[PDB]
Ligand binder design. Sequence first.
Ligand SMILES: COC(=O)c1c(O)c(C)cc(O)c1C(=O)c1c(O)cccc1O
Lengths: 140, 136
Amino acid sequence: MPAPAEVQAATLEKFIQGWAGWTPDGFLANWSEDCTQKTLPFSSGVPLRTRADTEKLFPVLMSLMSNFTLDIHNVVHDAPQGKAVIYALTKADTPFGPYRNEHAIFLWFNEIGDRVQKIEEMFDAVVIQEFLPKLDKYVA
Amino acid sequence: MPAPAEVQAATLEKFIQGWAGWTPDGFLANWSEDCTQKTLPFSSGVPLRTRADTEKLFPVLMSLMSNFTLDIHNVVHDAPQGKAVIYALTKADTPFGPYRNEHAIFLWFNEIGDRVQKIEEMFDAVVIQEFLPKLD
Ligand SMILES: COC(=O)c1c(O)c(C)cc(O)c1C(=O)c1c(O)cccc1O
């Protein structure tokens, strides 16, 4: 069975606050140790990211985006299924100009309800898929 | 104050059936009179579609895509808020070959709970954003 609705809702709130706080350890504190992220659409074939993969990504990214803002546009919470969706808009400044993105992010809670266990995320993945490998993989 | 969960759930199911049926009348049966569709992300600036816009548009669009199949990957229903999200994968055939799309569809039910009153949809919008304008 899913966790109590009230706990799931609190975890959804904390997940958003950890995202808004724009620190690696603050945001990932709300991910379970086994949590995965999957970029949507499936047709893009972007490989699943483990928690470890996201731990390598988020430091250099979050550093590159200054004045990060997170605006929550829609939250849909299905407590009987232990699932939720957020629609969010993000903005930041970068050395190359302003950054904007929007995210339809599907969440599943763990059984206790105090972590997110699975993430599927429809968003513009160009920075992750195209930019980071250049300034990260090849340079190092 | 939203309708009972089972009333909303019946409308959600009807909405999905009307989509899967791939007919304009069947799909629009579950729209409220004032229901609008809005393409996401907002940054794309794709204009809202009214119910009337959709009545005009969907006959030609569904005629272009044959053998339409709808795969429901995820449904998230928030009965206390009268909201739901569907993630769906669509497949069809066209003369230019096979067709695929994927949709994160956000739904709001009307207060009575028997219709969808608002839709915001993140999907690959190239047909409505590139094709139709060029066509006109
Ligand atoms: C005729 O299309 C619909 O019935 C339709 C639809 O029912 C839903 C629920 C979402 C859509 O985005 C569309 C659509 O407009 C569409 C499509 O499904 C495929 C390609 C281009 C499109 O514009």
